[PDB]
Design a protein around this ligand. Structure first.
Ligand code: ADP
Ligand code: ADP
Ligand code: MG
Ligand code: MG
Lengths: 528, 53, 532
């Protein structure tokens, strides 16, 4: 048809200049303002409606941000920052977004004037280095062997979540899970909360009945009623290969001419099943767990040896059982060895919860994996409880790997801001203004805590700044429940240094990344 | 009672806990020629599902 | 009269159209030049976001329709392929050359005369660069490579952290040095595996003294760390044996079926038994490994990795001294594995990186390898980090291969402009005008640099030209050839002393490619656009 001469495509949109920078900064500010009120011990929860019909009720920043679909690429960058913070340290997700928004605001203040973004970026990087130095300076060590202090750290981590009502139970569950899943092999230490330390939520009951199991629990039942549903000291054998006759890999058509060959073939199928079962029985086990199917004839031959069999178990669940009971998964039954038999599980029991059967292996001696059994009001309540427990376990692992500890309640923010402000007095350049501005941008955390508590922001923040101008007041923060100044070595709110370092680094680098853009091109085909 | 598909519930479970990054949105075709050259182009051995709504 | 089903544009109309297209392509990326340039953030139709400063990436992601604009985009791609740096500069120079050539043509100067003048100017500029503006890196030492990396990484997301990233780049490039035949050292960049993982700050990016694998162990029962690794690299899968299409199994006596089915896996069992019996600790294969073989490796207490990339496996094998085996077949018709096929490394570890795990092969023997793990705030920032890191690696490779460098900051452009303006008066009468326009168009680089910093471009360029004219005229002022632009303070500066260096190949190739593209576009004076 009509042909208009064009360089780029019709659907290609390009904008540049101060408009792009202002749009990016306001997008980041809006993203921060979305979750501004979900920070602190007095945070309010939010209902998120899934596009799939689900409901998410949470005050965690990452879930709220991941449930929101946005068009502006700056908001997408902010959501990616939230996800990065969640994946790296598992805490501080709400704080990093607010910090990035405040830093971008104070940067926009300078970009309105005739200051180039590169100068602001260099000042921001200098400030970030100084913040890291100050945070490492004001940190204090912790004794990992002290269970009380670890429980206190986990509590101060979870005081801002809905699970804070059952603080002691949640802290004990998280500490026990992290401690027992901790592993050491070949000179390489690991925690691996992701693979092991599985959280299983069964709606109903009371949350005070939730506990961490000394072993693994799965939603499975015996393959046949004659199986024993209660074994005192079981010997467990784990497999992946099916216990049933299966076709080979190659095309293996038979040609039957004699009369008895058909019955002979069926008899050898049965004999092969019997041989596999006898090879299993030779180790004299009590429980056989398979990731794949178990034939009925195999069940009968296992019963002849009084062996309980469970089939169709997930690979992750089977690995967890192997870690818990100290067994090794074996593919070919004829290659079973004595050390592959799992001895160490002190009880196996299949009990009925509600209208379902659940398999419990919950008396292991020194188990390296666990199931956190969560019981509660409903599915959404248990999902929020699981998220809070995940936060607690992440904080526990962070403390275990890095025993440095940092005062909370905004005390660290004010201390770092004061140190950077004092340091900025001896530079006498053009970068001192952005340096000081991004230093004072850290005060958005105590300000947010005061705002959420409902107290007077200006008076309390001025008093806190005046206190931090003194000679030893690095641990003075705000009480987020009463809206009063308090020493954090008395209140007891402390946070891992790793979380604070990650939060500051991520916020500063988000500001730096969003400050480097002045041109936006959109609408072009993906071309691939 | 295997037909009742107890496994459907856990299928929904890990479909809900599927991934970490953003889940993206369904691509929307705005022009008839867009649909025509979307189906005409792209690799032949790849299934394309279109939802009229 | 023609009766051609299409549109026809002839003469000044098509010439102006081509110049407009080239100028639009240039103006797209002119804002991303020099240390005071700023990145661009591109969004696809499916919402994918790319934040980049590289000209080649921008022009590749853009969807372009005009043929001259396509020529400029392919010019940027070619400059990226053959040099790796100066992708924006070549596009800007080519567009400015085309614009000035069209301005000359509009004055009834024949395009052939302009093309001849452009060719003469390019040849003389290359000769003058090679004879006057090059600096030998032998007297500069290792600091020359650091300075070149710093100059390359300016305007990038890793510019401020250049003090760290330049050392990382130089160490990575020096770790892969080798000498081929003729005794010429070679630096095979793209052999440095780059892994991107969001998480900690930029300054905590790691340079691995070995190789980094984006893979994990096949089974959870395998150890995650082996001290004295004996790496075996295989190019075949370890699964249950299956006969080919030409072989069929037909059973007439039933008693043979069980033996057939047993051998069907005993074959792979025997192969793995040989491989483990030679003493190997780490097994890497490009093919898959099924559960039975994984359990064999688990019982052996060895690390097995499946679906390893072919390039990664080749790099690991040659760094560790191993040999890729696509089959365990020797020249005697048997099935053997020898210890001489085993590579060695000081450690093989599966480490955790931001809630994910990757495999590090540390300190491979008989050859030094290098890998870089980039840490950033999110995926887009890591991608830009990788692009900038690749640019720096290419720049360092060019500097190390050819030991000549030229001052940056537009010093070369100003010197060439002055010299060619002087030289045009000695050649022809209209090619004189063409060479003068070539010299004038070479000044678009310092002009754009000054404009990006909001500095007085006119005054700074005038001062630079005065300095270079004094250098060329006065015989004892030859030290002024290094006077470039200091964009931080907006003043001329001796860039050779300041450490703003570029490889000579970047400037030479950019000049040649831009001249050829400008000549190609200037060769058109009629366009027939056939209707589809
Ligand atoms: N009892 C308390 N008094 C004052 N501040 C607190 C208290 N408990 C927690 N905080 C502060 O609240 C912040 C935690 O808020 P939270 O909702 O966890 O956000 P994020 O998930 O981003 O960490 C911490 O920085 C801590 O300093
Ligand atoms: N530190 C510096 N000071 C002054 N000029 C610089 C500096 N670093 C780079 N430049 C100049 O900026 C110009 C643009 O480089 P850049 O656009 O980043 O590379 P490319 O052209 O490969 O994209 C180069 O020609 C170089 O001479
Ligand atoms: Mg928290
Ligand atoms: Mg460059």
């Amino acid at each position: 048809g009509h042909r208009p001469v064009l360089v780029l495509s019709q659907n290609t949109k390009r904008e540049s200049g101060r408009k792009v920078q202002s749009g990016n900064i306001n997008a980041a500010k809006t993203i921060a303002d979305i979750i501004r009120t979900c920070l602190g011990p007095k945070s309010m929860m939010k209902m998120l409606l899934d596009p799939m019909g689900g409901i998410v009720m949470t005050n965690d920043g990452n879930a709220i941000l991941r449930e929101i679909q946005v068009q502006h690429p700056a908001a997408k960058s902010m959501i990616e920052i939230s996800r990065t913070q969640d994946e790296e340290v598992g805490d501080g997700t709400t704080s990093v977004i607010i910090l990035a928004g405040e830093m971008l605001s104070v940067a926009e203040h300078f970009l309105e004037q005739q200051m180039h973004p590169t100068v602001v970026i260099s000042a921001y990087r200098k400030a970030l280095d100084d913040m890291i130095s100050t945070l490492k300076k004001i940190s204090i060590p912790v004794d990992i062997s002290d269970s009380d202090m670890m429980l206190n750290i986990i509590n101060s981590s979870i005081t801002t979540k809905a699970i804070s009502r059952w603080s002691s139970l949640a802290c004990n569950i998280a500490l026990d899970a992290v401690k027992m899943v901790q592993f050491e092999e070949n000179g390489r230490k690991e925690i691996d909360i992701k693979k092991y330390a599985r959280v299983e939520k069964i709606p109903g009951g009371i949350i005070e009945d939730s506990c961490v199991l000394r072993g693994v629990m799965i939603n499975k039942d015996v393959t046949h009623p004659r199986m024993r549903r209660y074994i005192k000291n079981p010997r467990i054998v784990l497999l992946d290969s099916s216990l049933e006759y299966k076709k080979g890999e190659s095309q293996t058509d038979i040609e039957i001419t004699r009369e008895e060959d058909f019955t002979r073939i069926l008899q050898m199928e049965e004999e092969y099943i019997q041989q596999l079962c006898e090879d299993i029985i030779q180790l004299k086990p009590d429980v056989v767990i398979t990731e794949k199917g178990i034939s009925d004839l195999a069940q009968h031959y296992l019963m002849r040896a009084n062996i309980t069999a469970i089939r169709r178990v997930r690979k992750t669940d089977n690995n967890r059982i192997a870690r818990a009971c100290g067994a090794r998964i074996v593919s070919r039954p004829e290659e079973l060895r004595e050390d592959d038999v799992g001895t160490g599980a002190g009880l196996l029991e299949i009990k009925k919860i509600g209208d379902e059967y659940f398999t419990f292996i919950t008396d292991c001696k020194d188990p390296k994996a666990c199931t956190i059994l969560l019981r509660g009001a409903s599915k959404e309540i248990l999902s929020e409880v699981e998220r809070n427990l995940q936060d607690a376990m992440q904080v526990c692992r962070n403390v275990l790997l890095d025993p440095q500890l940092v005062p909370g309640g905004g005390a660290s923010e004010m201390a770092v801001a004061h140190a950077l402000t004092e340091k900025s007095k001896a530079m006498t350049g053009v970068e001192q203004w952005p340096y000081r501005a991004v230093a004072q941008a850290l005060e958005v955390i105590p300000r947010t805590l005061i705002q959420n508590c409902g107290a007077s922001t200006i008076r309390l923040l001025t008093s806190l700044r005046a206190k931090h101008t003194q000679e030893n007041c690095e641990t003075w923060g705000v009480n987020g429940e009463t809206g009063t100044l308090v020493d954090m070595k008395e209140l007891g709110i402390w946070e891992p240094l790793a979380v604070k370092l990650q939060t500051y680094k991520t916020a500063v680098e988000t500001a730096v990344l969003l400050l480097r853009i002045d041109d936006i091109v959109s609408g072009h085909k993906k071309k691939g | 009672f295997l037909q009742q598909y107890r496994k459907q519930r856990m299928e929904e479970m890990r479909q809900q806990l599927h991934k970490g990054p953003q889940f993206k949105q369904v691509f929307e075709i705005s022009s008839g020629e867009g649909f025509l050259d979307m189906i005409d182009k792209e690799q032949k051995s790849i299934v394309i599902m279109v939802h009229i709504y | 009269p023609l009766s051609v089903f299409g549109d026809r544009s002839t003469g000044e109309t098509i010439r102006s159209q081509n110049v407009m297209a080239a100028a639009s392509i240039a103006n797209i990326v002119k804002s991303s030049l020099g240390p005071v340039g700023l990145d661009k953030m591109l969004v696809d139709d499916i919402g994918d976001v790319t934040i980049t400063n590289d000209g080649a990436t921008i022009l590749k992601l853009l969807e372009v329709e005009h043929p001259a604009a396509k020529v400029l985009c392919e010019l940027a791609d070619l400059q990226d392929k053959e040099v790796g740096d100066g992708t924006t500069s070549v596009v800007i120079i080519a567009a400015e050359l085309l614009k000035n050539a069209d301005e000359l043509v509009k004055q009834k100067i024949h395009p052939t005369s302009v093309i001849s003048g452009y060719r003469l100017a390019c040849k003389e500029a290359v000769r003058y660069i090679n004879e006057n503006l090059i600096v030998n890196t032998d007297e500069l030492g290792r600091d020359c490579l650091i300075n070149a990396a710093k100059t390359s990484m300016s305007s990038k997301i890793i510019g401020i952290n250049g003090d760290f990233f330049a050392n990382m780049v130089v160490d990575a490039v020096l770790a892969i040095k080798y000498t081929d035949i003729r005794g010429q050292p070679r630096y095979p960049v793209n052999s440095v595996n780059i892994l991107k993982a969001h998480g900690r700050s930029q300054m905590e990016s790691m340079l691995i003294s070995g190789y980094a694998l984006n893979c994990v162990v096949g089974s959870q029962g395998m150890p995650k760390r082996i001290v004295n690794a004996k790496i075996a690299c295989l190019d075949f899968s370890l699964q249950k044996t299956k006969m080919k299409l030409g072989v069929q199994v037909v059973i007439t006596d039933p008693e043979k079926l069980d033996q057939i089915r047993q051998r069907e896996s005993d074959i792979t069992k025997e192969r793995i038994q040989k491989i483990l019996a030679t003493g190997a600790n780490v097994i890497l294969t490009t093919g898959g490994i099924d559960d039975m073989c994984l359990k064999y490796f688990v019982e052996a207490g060895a690390m097995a990795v499946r679906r390893v990339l072919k390039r990664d496996l080749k790099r690991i094998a040659k760094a560790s001294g191993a040999t890729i085996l696509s089959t365990l077949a020797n020249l005697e018709g048997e099935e053997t594995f020898e210890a001489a096929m085993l590579g060695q490394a000081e450690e093989v570890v599966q480490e955790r990186i931001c809630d994910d795990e990757l495999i590090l092969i540390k300190n491979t023997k008989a050859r030094t390898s290098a890998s870089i793990i980039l840490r950033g705030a999110n995926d887009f920032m890591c991608d830009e980090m990788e692009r900038s890191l690749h640019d720096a690696l290419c720049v360092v490779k060019r500097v190390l291969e050819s030991k000549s460098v030229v001052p940056g900051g537009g010093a070369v452009e100003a010197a060439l402009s002055i010299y060619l303006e002087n030289y045009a008066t000695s050649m022809g009468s209209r090619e004189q005008l063409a060479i003068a326009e070539f010299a004038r168009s070479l000044l678009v680089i310092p002009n754009t640099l000054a404009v990006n910093a909001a500095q007085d471009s006119t005054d700074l360029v005038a001062k630079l030209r005065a300095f270079h004219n004094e250098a060329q005229v006065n015989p004892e002022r030859k030290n002024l050839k290094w006077i470039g632009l200091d964009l931080s303070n907006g003043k001329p500066r001796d860039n050779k002393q300041a450490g703003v260096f570029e490889p000579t190949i970047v400037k030479v190739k950019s000049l040649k490619f831009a001249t050829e593209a400008a000549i190609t576009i200037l060769r058109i004076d009629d366009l027939i656009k056939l209707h589809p």
